[PDB]
Amino acid sequence: LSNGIEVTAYIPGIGHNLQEHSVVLIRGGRVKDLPGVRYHIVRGALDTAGVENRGQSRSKYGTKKP
Amino acid sequence: ARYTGPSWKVSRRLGISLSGTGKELERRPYAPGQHGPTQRKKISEYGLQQAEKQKLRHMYGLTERQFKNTFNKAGKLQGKHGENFMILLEQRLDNIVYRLGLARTRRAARQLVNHGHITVDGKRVDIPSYQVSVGQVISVREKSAKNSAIAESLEVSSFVPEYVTFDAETLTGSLNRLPERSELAAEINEAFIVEFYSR
Amino acid sequence: AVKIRLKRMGSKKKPFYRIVVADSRFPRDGRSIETIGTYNPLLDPVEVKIDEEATLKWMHNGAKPSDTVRNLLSREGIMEKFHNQKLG
RNA sequence: AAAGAGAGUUUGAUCCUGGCUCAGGACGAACGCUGGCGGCGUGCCUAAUACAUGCAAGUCGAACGAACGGAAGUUAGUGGCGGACGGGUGAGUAACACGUGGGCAACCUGCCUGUAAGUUGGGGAUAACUCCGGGAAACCGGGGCUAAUACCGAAUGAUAGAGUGUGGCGCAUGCCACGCUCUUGAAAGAUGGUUUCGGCUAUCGCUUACAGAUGGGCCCGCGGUGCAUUAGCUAGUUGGUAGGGUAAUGGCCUACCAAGGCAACGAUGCAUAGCCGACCUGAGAGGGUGAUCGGCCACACUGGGACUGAGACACGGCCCAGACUCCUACGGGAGGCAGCAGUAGGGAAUCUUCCGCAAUGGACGAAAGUCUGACGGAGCAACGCCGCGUGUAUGAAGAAGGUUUUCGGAUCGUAAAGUACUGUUGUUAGAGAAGAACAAGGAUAAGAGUAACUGCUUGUCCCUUGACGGUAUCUAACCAGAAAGCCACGGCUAACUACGUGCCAGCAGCCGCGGUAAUACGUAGGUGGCAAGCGUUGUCCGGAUUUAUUGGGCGUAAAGCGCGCGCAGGCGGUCUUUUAAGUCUGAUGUGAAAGCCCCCGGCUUAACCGGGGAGGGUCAUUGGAAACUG
Numbered sequence: 001l002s003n004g005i006e007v008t009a010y011i012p013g014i015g016h017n018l019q020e021h022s023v024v025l026i027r028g029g030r031v032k033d034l035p036g037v038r039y040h041i042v043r044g045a046l047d048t049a050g051v052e053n054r055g056q057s058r059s060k061y062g063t064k065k066p
Numbered sequence: 067a068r069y070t071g072p073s074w075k076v077s078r079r080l081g082i083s084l085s086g087t088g089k090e091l092e093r094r095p096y097a098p099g100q101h102g103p104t105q106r107k108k109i110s111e112y113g114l115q116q117a118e119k120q121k122l123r124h125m126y127g128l129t130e131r132q133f134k135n136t137f138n139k140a141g142k143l144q145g146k147h148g149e150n151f152m153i154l155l156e157q158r159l160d161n162i163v164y165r166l167g168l169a170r171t172r173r174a175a176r177q178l179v180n181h182g183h184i185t186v187d188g189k190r191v192d193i194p195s196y197q198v199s200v201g202q203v204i205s206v207r208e209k210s211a212k213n214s215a216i217a218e219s220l221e222v223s224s225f226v227p228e229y230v231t232f233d234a235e236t237l238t239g240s241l242n243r244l245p246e247r248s249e250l251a252a253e254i255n256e257a258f259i260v261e262f263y264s265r
Numbered sequence: 266a267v268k269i270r271l272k273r274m275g276s277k278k279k280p281f282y283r284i285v286v287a288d289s290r291f292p293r294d295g296r297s298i299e300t301i302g303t304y305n306p307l308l309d310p311v312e313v314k315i316d317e318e319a320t321l322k323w324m325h326n327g328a329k330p331s332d333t334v335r336n337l338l339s340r341e342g343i344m345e346k347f348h349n350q351k352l353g
Numbered sequence: 354a355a356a357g358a359g360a361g362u363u364u365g366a367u368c369c370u371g372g373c374u375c376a377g378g379a380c381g382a383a384c385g386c387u388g389g390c391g392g393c394g395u396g397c398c399u400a401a402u403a404c405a406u407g408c409a410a411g412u413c414g415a416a417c418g419a420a421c422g423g424a425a426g427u428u429a430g431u432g433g434c435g436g437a438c439g440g441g442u443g444a445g446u447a448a449c450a451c452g453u454g455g456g457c458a459a460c461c462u463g464c465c466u467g468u469a470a471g472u473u474g475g476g477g478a479u480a481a482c483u484c485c486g487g488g489a490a491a492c493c494g495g496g497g498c499u500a501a502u503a504c505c506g507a508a509u510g511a512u513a514g515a516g517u518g519u520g521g522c523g524c525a526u527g528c529c530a531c532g533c534u535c536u537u538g539a540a541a542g543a544u545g546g547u548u549u550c551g552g553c554u555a556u557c558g559c560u561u562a563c564a565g566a567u568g569g570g571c572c573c574g575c576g577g578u579g580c581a582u583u584a585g586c587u588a589g590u591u592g593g594u595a596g597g598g599u600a601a602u603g604g605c606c607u608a609c610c611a612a613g614g615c616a617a618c619g620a621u622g623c624a625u626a627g628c629c630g631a632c633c634u635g636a637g638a639g640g641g642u643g644a645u646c647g648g649c650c651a652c653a654c655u656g657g658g659a660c661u662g663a664g665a666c667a668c669g670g671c672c673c674a675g676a677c678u679c680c681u682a683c684g685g686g687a688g689g690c691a692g693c694a695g696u697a698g699g700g701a702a703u704c705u706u707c708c709g710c711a712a713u714g715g716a717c718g719a720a721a722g723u724c725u726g727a728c729g730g731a732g733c734a735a736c737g738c739c740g741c742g743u744g745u746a747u748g749a750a751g752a753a754g755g756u757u758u759u760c761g762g763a764u765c766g767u768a769a770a771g772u773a774c775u776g777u778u779g780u781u782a783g784a785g786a787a788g789a790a791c792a793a794g795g796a797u798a799a800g801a802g803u804a805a806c807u808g809c810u811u812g813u814c815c816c817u818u819g820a821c822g823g824u825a826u827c828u829a830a831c832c833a834g835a836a837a838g839c840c841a842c843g844g845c846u847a848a849c850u851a852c853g854u855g856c857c858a859g860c861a862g863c864c865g866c867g868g869u870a871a872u873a874c875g876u877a878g879g880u881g882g883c884a885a886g887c888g889u890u891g892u893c894c895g896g897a898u899u900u901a902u903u904g905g906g907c908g909u910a911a912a913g914c915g916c917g918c919g920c921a922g923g924c925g926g927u928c929u930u931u932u933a934a935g936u937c938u939g940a941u942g943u944g945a946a947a948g949c950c951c952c953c954g955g956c957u958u959a960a961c962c963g964g965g966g967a968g969g970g971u972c973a974u975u976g977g978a979a980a981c982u983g
């Protein structure tokens with residue numbers, strides 16, 4: 001993070017485009033299945049792009065109107 | 067016309083025939099959708115309370131936010147909260163024009179008020195939510211005057227409530243006095259409205 | 266030097282003034298000693314309500330009306346009384 | 354008057370205890386998808402980080418020595434007033450800083466208002482100007498000349514000082530009034546009327562004294578935060594005597610003398626924080642916060658100091674030291690946006706290098722007038738609240754086409770399409786407000802003052818001024834035409850069917866769904882909540898009686914010290930008399946304005962804005978009652 005803390009996030013949606021050395025925006029939210037994951041990566045805010053071929057619930061996952 | 071959708075299913079979903087009768091009965095009286103004819107189900111306490119709100123909101127045809135605001139200031143009066151709510155809503159300029167017979171439906175009345183076709187105390191008013199007082203005169207102020215739509219709706223007007231006075235030569239409507247709860251709707255449970263907003 | 270002056274309040278392009286007594290040093294809408302009356306300029310016959318007793322009390326202690334106030338007090342007619350009580 | 358909703362989850366099933374999660378409301382919010390308008394407000398919460406470039410504080414020729422003009426009429430410097438107001442920020446500060454209530458017989462106060470005495474007589478200069486000298490530049494020296502409401506003596510004048518007489522007094526120190534003796538302390542002219550020229554006089558000023566008003570200074574009772582895994586702290590510290598200093602009391606300071614002062618009713622220390630009116634939530638009691646608006650405080654690159662002044666230890670003043678940037682001819686010089694805009698950086702995150710002094714209020718002036726990034730307006734951003742537009746009415750056992758069907762049908766759907774109608778909004782063209790009171794200038798009238806004017810005060814007429822802006826607002830016509838998205842549909846919780854996948858992809862706040870018939874994953878059709886929005890995240894209150902005063906408990910669920918003796922503290926049998934600290938009650942003063950609430954009124958309604966009222970205190974002075982505690 002920008003304040004110098006090393007955390008573990010989670011990518012929602014079907015398929016992504018993340019690689020090492022990539023800038024992303026994280027937001028609150030814990031995933032129950034994963035032991036240590038406590039944050040969610042928002043999709044469509046920065047280098048991370050929206051999910052491909054999303055028809056409904058598009059405000060999440062950051063996919064624009066088709 | 068804030069809600070421009072089909073004004074036929076809302077009567078079917080609610081189960082009460084808005085604007086007299088015919089919207090619900092005669093045709094399919096059951097709810098709209100794929101699973102209308104079959105697949106009935108029970109209603110919980112939340113459903114019964116919520117369904118009462120929808121009748122008042124869609125009968126007078128106004129938005130949710132106003133409904134909450136006019137409910138709050140209705141309960142600031144002295145008396146029964148539920149009864150004061152319909153009395154306060156009955157005061158709206160849309161309803162008075164509907165009651166006088168100048169329009170067939172509330173949607174027609176709302177547009178009639180909207181497009182500066184009426185006047186109160188000789189001053190043009192374009193706010194549908196204007197709250198009419200007792201004794202004020204409402205007219206048309208010539209211009210449209212002998213308009214086919216307004217004249218057609220004058221003939222098909224059934225009856226006129228006793229708390230409004232109107233003669234079809236000068237079109238000078240007026241509120242005789244503040245109305246009474248018994249003579250309004252009589253098919254709504256105001257006790258459920260007030261319980262819905264207290265949760 | 267304490268002097269009586271208007272105080273602007275109201276909405277955008279709808280001014281409404283409240284006649285107050287305050288020092289020249291203090292802000293236009295800040296500290297004041299006390300309030301005397303109001304002034305509506307928007308009304309075509311401009312209407313003003315004044316105490317007619319606290320003004321005369323203050324003007325014998327070193328209070329000076331401003332440019333607009335003097336017109337208000339003269340039209341209402343208490344500067345005549347300030348004249349008469351001064352010499353009498 | 355007001356007055357309180359629950360649900361899921363431990364088990365094969367149950368009842369209790371108990372935690373976790375959810376349904377509501379609010380942001381100076383951010384992010385995602387989408388996006389028509391108008392009114393009213395709001396917009397660097399982080400780096401009190403560093404700052405290009407413009408503008409934010411001047412004014413007076415009616416206080417004193419110049420350039421255009423045949424010497425008429427307008428424009429630098431000395432001098433006065435103002436720069437201590439207005440505007441910004443929240444670093445520090447746990448204390449008389451603030452809130453509330455008092456005291457000052459212990460204090461100061463320019464301008465403003467009233468009253469009383471006068472505004473008399475001289476002297477020596479020096480800026481500007483003119484030469485010389487030094488230096489890159491900032492700017493520094495020397496010689497000569499001149500004026501003032503500049504500066505310094507002099508006459509006269511103290512309720513200023515000393516020594517007293519009397520009275521009337523108060524709260525201990527002491528106060529008020531009058532009288533006597535002695536000694537000190539003041540000043541300025543300018544602009545006009547008259548006369549004569551003596552002189553007089555009007556206005557603005559000048560000096561002293563006393564009142565009022567205004568603004569401040571000092572002291573005190575009470576009130577509002579975490580840690581005892583922080584127990585001692587202090588030495589000008591505590592008190593006294595004499596002096597110094599201040600507007601004023603005081604260890605405020607100094608010499609001497611004594612050893613005191615504070616603390617378990619929490620000193621000291623560490624950590625955090627500007628305080629309040631108020632804001633959000635709550636049935637209430639309370640819990641959290643202190644952005645915008647108003648009051649007080651502290652700060653002005655970081656430390657220290659003082660000058661001038663009525664007022665400063667001074668945001669756009671000075672001196673020294675430090676860090677940083679810049680100009681140097683290497684000798685030396687110049688700076689401070691936490692002012693309005695704007696730039697870089699930090700950040701998930703916040704606007705224009707705009708128009709005016711027309712209105713209000715400021716500084717100067719006698720007045721026009723000058724200055725005012727205060728303030729009025731405009732610009733950008735769905736950031737919030739409020740209003741209403743994306744069309745109305747009639748119209749099929751029911752158009753086509755989707756989507757399903759035990760293939761008959763059902764649903765989208767009166768929604769289409771058709772006929773009839775409207776112009777809020779749009780486009781075009783015409784009319785066009787309020788906000789303006791003024792000031793000054795001109796005639797008068799009446800007054801106080803006059804030997805008389807000029808002039809001063811009040812009254813009535815004439816004339817004059819708009820950034821917004823041709824803005825708001827009307828009427829004339831044409832167009833259904835340019836204007837609907839967002840989230841959910843197993844339960845909590847309103848709303849279900851097909852196809853694809855096959856413990857994979859994936860979903861999720863909790864219970865938990867997915868392992869070739871998934872109402873829970875993905876897409877369709879349909880539906881449900883809202884709507885110019887809708888969802889997610891972060892923070893706070895509620896539900897949470899889950900710190901229980903209102904309003905919980907300790908046999909077995911967490912929870913009675915292993916037991917005693919006892920200092921401090923808490924509580925205490927019966928009756929009578931008295932007192933009045935607690936208790937109850939009346940009056941007076943105060944608890945600002947704005948905000949919540951109640952009653953009216955204006956914006957075409959609302960939001961919003963005015964007028965009146967109410968509430969709000971373990972508050973101060975004073976008068977009562979005596980049952981209860983003392």
Ligand SMILES: [Mg+2]
Nearest residue numbers: 056057060860
């Ligand atoms: Mg989903």
Ligand SMILES: [Mg+2]
Nearest residue numbers: 306308309311
């Ligand atoms: Mg006017």
Ligand SMILES: [Mg+2]
Nearest residue numbers: 362363364365
């Ligand atoms: Mg089980």
Ligand SMILES: [Mg+2]
Nearest residue numbers: 371372897899
């Ligand atoms: Mg429980």
Ligand SMILES: [Mg+2]
Nearest residue numbers: 264265377895
């Ligand atoms: Mg609630």
Ligand SMILES: [Mg+2]
Nearest residue numbers: 375376377378
């Ligand atoms: Mg909610």
Ligand SMILES: [Mg+2]
Nearest residue numbers: 387388389735
């Ligand atoms: Mg748009």
Ligand SMILES: [Mg+2]
Nearest residue numbers: 386387388735
């Ligand atoms: Mg956009």
Ligand SMILES: [Mg+2]
Nearest residue numbers: 397398399442
């Ligand atoms: Mg800041």
Ligand SMILES: [Mg+2]
Nearest residue numbers: 401444654655
């Ligand atoms: Mg600093």
Ligand SMILES: [Mg+2]
Nearest residue numbers: 405406407688
């Ligand atoms: Mg500069």
Ligand SMILES: [Mg+2]
Nearest residue numbers: 408409725726
């Ligand atoms: Mg300027």
Ligand SMILES: [Mg+2]
Nearest residue numbers: 414415416417
């Ligand atoms: Mg001259």
Ligand SMILES: [Mg+2]
Nearest residue numbers: 415557718719
């Ligand atoms: Mg002068």
Ligand SMILES: [Mg+2]
Nearest residue numbers: 414428429430
């Ligand atoms: Mg000059």
Ligand SMILES: [Mg+2]
Nearest residue numbers: 438439440441
């Ligand atoms: Mg200030």
